[PDB]
Amino acid sequence: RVDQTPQRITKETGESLTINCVVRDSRCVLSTGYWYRKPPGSRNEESISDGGRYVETVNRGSKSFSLRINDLTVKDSGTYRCKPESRYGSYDAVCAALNDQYGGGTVVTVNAA
Numbered sequence: 020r021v022d023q024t025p026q027r028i029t030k031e032t033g034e035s036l037t038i039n040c041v042v043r044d045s046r047c048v049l050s051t052g053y054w055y056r057k058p059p060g061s062r063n064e065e066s067i068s069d070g071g072r073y074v075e076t077v078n079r080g081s082k083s084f085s086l087r088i089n090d091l092t093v094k095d096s097g098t099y100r101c102k103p104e105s106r107y108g109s110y111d112a113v114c115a116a117l118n119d120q121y122g123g124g125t126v127v128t129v130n131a132a
C-alpha cells in the first residue's frame with residue numbers, strides 16, 4: 020500500500036507545504052520516488068522535480084519519501100500524487116508493480132496573496 024498524507028490542505032501564499040508518502044505492508048525496497056501535479060479543473064498530471072522551491076527527501080529505511088514546496092503561490096494549487104520506485108523490481112515482478120502504484124493524492128489550495 021502507498022499511504023499519502025495529508026489528503027487535502029489549504030495554505031496561504033508564502034507558506035510551505037509538505038506531503039508524505041510511505042510504502043506499507045510490502046516486501047519491496049524503496050529506491051526513490053516521484054511527484055506529479057494536476058492543476059485545478061484538469062485531468063492531466065505532469066511531473067515535479069527536486070530543485071529551487073521544491074525539496075525532496077527519501078528515507079529508504081522507513082520506506083518513505085516526501086515533497087516540500089516553499090514559497091507557495093496560487094500557481095501551486097492542484098492535486099499532487101506520489102509514485103514510488105522499487106530498488107529490485109528487475110528481480111521481482113511484485114515489486115516491479117510497485118513502480119506503477121500511486122498515493123491517493125493530496126488536494127492543495129493556496130489562497131491568493
Ligand SMILES: [Cl-]
Pocket residue numbers: 046047048049105106107108111114
Ligand atoms: Cl524491491
